[PDB]
Write a structure and sequence with these properties.
76% helix; vinculin binding (chain A); cell junction (chain A); globular; cadherin binding (chain A); Helix Hairpins; mainly alpha; homodimer; 3 strands
């Protein structure tokens, strides 16, 4: 009605008008006498009162918009119910016409709010709820229509009420997201882990460095043994899954026992380091072996997910085409039989997607997958309901139309999910696994030929065609994310040659082999051409992979130096590093802003922070191929230089913590010193992993950049741990006391002097907090 | 005074002037045609561009102020060093004069920034730092003066440079806080006080009360697991503290594991939750058990903080009197020994104060405590150096005078701190703990008598006298917050009887028992009189407590938005309001049975029943509450009435028999306190857009569902509090000779 809602708005415009005047005058008097102290304060005083008036206006105006949205919502709500309860195709057509515009208005208003919502989690939630409503309003029409023509088909009634229950859910979803408030901030350190197993594993990597002998960790925290069993129970779901390879099952099992035995050897060593004076070198080595075994298990889980994407995401619409054919031939029992096959495969698809989510630290990507999965789950029974309807009336024109509507809808939604799962998995890993499975399947295909097994030939060729088609699709779509040029050309020629030349010849050879083995007695067949055409599928895929990973020198310790090859890395690999180095620069700029307000003369901690910041950046510039480190011999010495400086900073941090009487402030500082020791150890293990090189065609290639990815990740983590130390080191030094016990020091070693008030580094510290 | 900023600042004023015009016109055209869609949007986009221009101005102007502050700072800096290095009482006096104003200016500018700093921690550093700076600039003067008069007293030089060092530390502290970055660990910063653990616990309760998240739980398990482990980190400091009782240590430990296991059972109800619309049944039971376990832990932390105030605030100047006596007798070794004891006790005092701060939601009380604590911290080594100086020259009259000035200053500063800690702790809690400790100490005192333990008798009697004296002090001052009436008088008669009659007789019995036992055993005294006098201490404190308790303790148009709610959402509310009416009708049937109409236990139940119904009628929404500002005041009206009913229930608690009814009555009073807090969260969490600011997500319809649920739970908790006190209310009325159960209400003085 907006009788009071838009009445307060008029009054709010007056205050903005009044304050605006008072501002103009105070602003004027200041401009004429700008050296005036008082006239200036009056103009600030004015600007503040102007700001309150303006914000109270904009806030009030935004409430007005929310209300307006909720009224449009109740309109579309009653519309959908009126559409559902329509009794004649007349009264139905009337409603749909009156409603369609009301849906569009609502959609626009919804889009607007979506933008004003700060909570990024809800912005995608609103977009989902809008899109669902947008899509099903027409479907509900066609559905509740059919129910009016064939009133005795329970299959239609069920399907209609399903789309309606879906729509009403979306309407509430819109309402729910529309009222999300107010200001949120997602953590960058520590955060954010989308996967429950991904989070658990990363959390455990932080708990191992802390001493569990203490009464603040034994009687007060869940034991490392309990935490690890929560990981193992998660890794168990991955290994015991139906879609998991028996070869991979035994790898996770082996890694779980390996990560378990690595903890017992660490727990027995924490008893040995009870003195905690000089940190045991036997203990530091036990922490290193522990942090390595967590990494190894993580990598096994990654590949375990990759095997699922390779095996379950090929020829996905096959059960549906079979179910639809049984529905077309009006076989009332065959549909019900193929419906349970179709539902089981959809459940397998969902399972593979959820597994992929569990190990992904891509919070955003994981949400899209889970959203896409839940939509597939809701769509599945609706597809089955359309098939059952067609099975009862295979001649009915509407049953043929509805089936086709859900036929293209299911294919579309399976596509949305597979692309979402492709986004949370590495293309490199996918290609390496695809290649391994193609080789295996082509080998099985040729053995089927030699064993005169027509069944095996057709089923192995089906898996090859499906996997080969999926590779072309994942690579083509990935090529869209890159600037067209020399790189994207070769990668697309390779994909076209596979799909347009290699795959068609392979298909023809399979066809001919099956044909020549079907007619009795076994007719002549050129096994040479068959073997050659199969060998080509593997060669085709291997070349696509060769192109995606192609390390080239220009644009228009074998081979070169470790930093030169890093600069020459493929545009695909060069992108992932640039993203991680940018994420590191974010944490690097935080240190520079902190270390600049301090004066060192005087202070060793802030000197060690700068020295570490320097060497830390050389290692990230080596992965960029622009660093002064020429070989892995320079990188290992750089990881040792930060380890020496990280230990010197650990020494100075413990002394300030010892002189600190307040155990609350002391507790924070010592924790960030444990963080430094962990990421110091994690950077030395990242310098040990060599950037391996592979090739078959001749031209050398680097498969995966996870070894370099983890070095930037451990550096960014150390950069955050050092800034939070320098910060806490000062807070503890303000509580500093006259030592009369151990260690004796009346005057502190490090002097916390503030830098002189300077014009230019002050205007740069504001621009750092503004961005 | 940099001019680049003064130049930029004018240009900024121009954009604010230009935008201001464009705003005036768009605003004008709208006022003449307010029903206009387009003209309105033009006025909004204008207001947005006006806002950017205005904030760009205010930000730039605030940089100018920060710089200006840092320049005043370098001035005061060099001043303090020039004051130290003064060679004559001439130049010294010259400097102090030139500096004193420069210190005042700096102090003002500092105070300003303090206000603009967002995160409270920084705001405390600023306050503390400014305090030390303010206090020691004069002390540095008198100190560096003495050195000039007695150049061969190394003790003075040491003291002076310590003051200088502290002062320079405060200056850097000011500088450091002044440049406080608004976002550390992705804006986890509270901005609103008081305690870090108090804030953490309250934010965890909000993140669990209004958090259905019907689409997916992407950040549900990682945020709450990080928040609970942050709370457990704080509770560990409370439990592992030296001044903590081993009995209390095991209670916090037990409550941490209890609040941890309560979260796993809640998360498994959310782990096995895929695509569910509401699933409110049985899931709310796991939310309820979770919200109770957070209250139980906080309740344990509260009492833990209370045990520290009871024990550590007994003897405060005793180590100092001992240290001063060794100094007076010129014993440097003795001083150095007692200096460590004195410093350790001061550190204990500080520790108890900081702990109390961590659980206080009193942002302003907490600041005074932290300020007072930091001043004690700075004062402590200066006291020790005055003692060490006197120890070397015990005949030195200046050393005697300085000792006395520092002694008086310590005593006053310790009193300021303890009164500040008394202000952030509930008098009720203090008295309940004081009572428990008195009983324990009197019991130890009598056992000491029976075991002919003179040491124990003197030591236990010392603790009793000290605790009793502290109770009188904490109650007496507290009474200077009320006006004369039957309340204040009865509290004060009880306190006088303790101090003037009970305590003196107890002291005499202790004295006589020690005198007799220090002569020739056994029984040269009357154990009966001793036992009787000790019990009377407990009875006296118990009576003070009873006396203190019998008292009467004194987002716009959101309802419109509630009326336009979806029919699926509106159906869910109608169901919950019907479930509430079920519990409402049970109360109406129970309250109509009472003999008295004028007694406060019935009128509070009816008053709460009334306000409780207005909040459920707002969610319909046709309630008399216009918006969130009326709903927050309604949640505080039931909180005030729920606390008045808690005082009535505790005063009547000793009149219900079989002890199982006392366990039950007190249990339903803790149910009321929980659901009054639960209802307060639901109203407050809604108001996050109207005023700055917020930390995590909150939805209107989700907060509404939790509000009806917390109102239904409170309607059941009030009906079971009244039902468990039908006979106990009539027994108390007959006990005092009252016609009807009535509590007096006295308002604040001045």
């Amino acid at each position: 009605e907006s009788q009071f809602l838009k009445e307060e708005l008029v009054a709010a415009v007056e205050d903005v008008r009044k304050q605006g005047d008072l501002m103009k005058a105070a602003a004027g008097e200041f401009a004429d006498d700008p050296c005036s102290s008082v006239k200036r304060g009056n103009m600030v005083r004015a600007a503040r009162a102007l700001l309150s008036a303006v914000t109270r206006l904009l806030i009030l105006a935004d409430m007005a918009d929310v209300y307006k949205l909720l009224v449009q919502l109740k309109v579309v709500e009653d519309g959908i119910l009126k559409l559902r309860n329509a009794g004649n195709e007349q009264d139905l057509g009337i409603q749909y016409k009156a409603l369609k515009p009301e849906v569009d208005k609502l959609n626009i208003m919804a889009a607007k709010r979506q933008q004003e919502l700060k909570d990024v989690g809800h912005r995608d939630q609103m977009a989902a709820a809008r899109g669902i409503l947008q899509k099903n309003v027409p479907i509900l029409y066609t559905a509740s229509q059919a129910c009016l023509q064939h009133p005795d088909v329970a299959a239609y009634k069920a399907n209609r009420d399903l789309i309606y229950k879906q729509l009403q859910q979306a309407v509430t979803g819109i309402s729910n997201a529309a009222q999300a408030t107010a200001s949120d901030d997602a953590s960058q350190h520590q955060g954010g882990g989308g996967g429950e197993l991904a989070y658990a594993l990363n959390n455990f990597d932080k708990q191992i460095i802390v001493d569990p002998l203490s009464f603040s960790e034994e009687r007060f925290r869940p034991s490392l043994e309990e935490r690890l069993e929560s990981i193992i129970s998660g890794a168990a779901l991955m290994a015991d899954s139906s879609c998991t390879r028996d070869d991979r099952r035994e790898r996770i099992v082996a890694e779980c026992n390996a990560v378990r035995q690595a903890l017992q050897d660490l727990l027995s060593e924490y008893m040995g380091n009870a003195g905690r004076k000089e940190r045991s070198d036997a203990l530091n080595s036990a922490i290193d072996k522990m942090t390595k075994k967590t990494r190894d298990l993580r990598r096994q889980l990654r590949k375990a997910v990759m095997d699922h994407v390779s095996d379950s995401f090929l020829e996905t619409n096959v059960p549906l085409l079979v179910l639809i054919e049984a529905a077309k031939n009006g076989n009332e029992k065959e549909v019900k039989e193929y419906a349970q096959v179709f539902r089981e495969h959809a459940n397998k698809l969902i399972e593979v997607a959820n597994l992929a989510c569990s190990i992904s630290n891509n919070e955003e990507g994981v949400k899209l997958v889970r959203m896409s999965a839940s939509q597939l789950e809701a769509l599945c029974p609706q597809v089955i309901n359309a098939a059952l309807a067609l099975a009862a009336k295979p001649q009915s024109k509407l049953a043929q139309e509805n089936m086709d509507l859900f036929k293209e809808q299911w294919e579309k939604q399976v596509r949305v999910l597979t692309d979402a799962v492709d986004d949370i998995t590495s293309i490199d890993d996918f290609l390496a696994v695809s290649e391994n499975h193609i080789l295996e399947d082509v080998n099985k295909c040729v053995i089927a030929l030699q064993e005169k097994d027509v069944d095996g030939l057709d089923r192995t060729a089906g898996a090859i065609r499906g996997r080969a088609a999926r590779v072309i699709h994942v690579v083509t779509s990935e090529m869209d994310n890159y600037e067209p040029g020399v790189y994207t050309e070769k990668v697309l020629e390779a994909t076209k040659l596979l799909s347009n030349t290699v795959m068609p010849r392979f298909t023809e050879q399979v066809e001919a082999a099956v044909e020549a083995l079907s007619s009795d007695p076994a007719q002549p067949m050129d096994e040479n051409e068959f073997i050659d055409a199969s060998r080509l599928v593997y060669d085709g895929i291997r070349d696509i992979r060769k192109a995606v990973l192609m390390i080239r020198t220009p644009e228009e310790i074998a081979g070169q130096s470790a930093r030169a090859i890093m600069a020459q890395l493929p545009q695909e690999q060069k992108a992932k590093i640039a993203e991680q180095v940018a994420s590191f620069q974010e944490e690097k700029s935080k240190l520079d802003a902190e270390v600049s307000k301090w004066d060192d003369s005087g202070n060793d901690i802030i000197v060690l922070a700068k020295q570490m910041c320097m060497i830390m950046m050389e290692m990230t510039d080596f992965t960029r191929g622009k660093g002064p480190l020429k070989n892995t011999s320079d990188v290992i010495s750089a990881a040792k230089k930060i380890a020496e400086a990280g230990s010197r900073m650990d020494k100075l941090g413990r002394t300030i913590a010892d002189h600190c009487p307040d155990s609350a402030c002391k507790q924070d500082l010592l924790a960030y010193l444990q963080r430094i020791a962990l990421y110091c150890h994690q950077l030395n293990i990242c310098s040990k992993v060599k950037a391996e090189v592979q090739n078959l065609g001749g031209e050398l290639v680097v498969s995966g950049v996870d070894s370099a990815m983890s070095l930037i990740q451990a550096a960014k983590n150390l950069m955050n741990a050092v800034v939070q130390t320098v910060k806490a080191s000062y807070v503890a030094s303000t509580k500093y006391q006259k030592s009369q016990g151990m260690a004796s020091l009346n005057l502190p070693a490090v002097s916390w002097k503030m830098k002189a008030p300077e014009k230019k580094p002050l205007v740069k510290r504001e621009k750092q907090d503004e961005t």
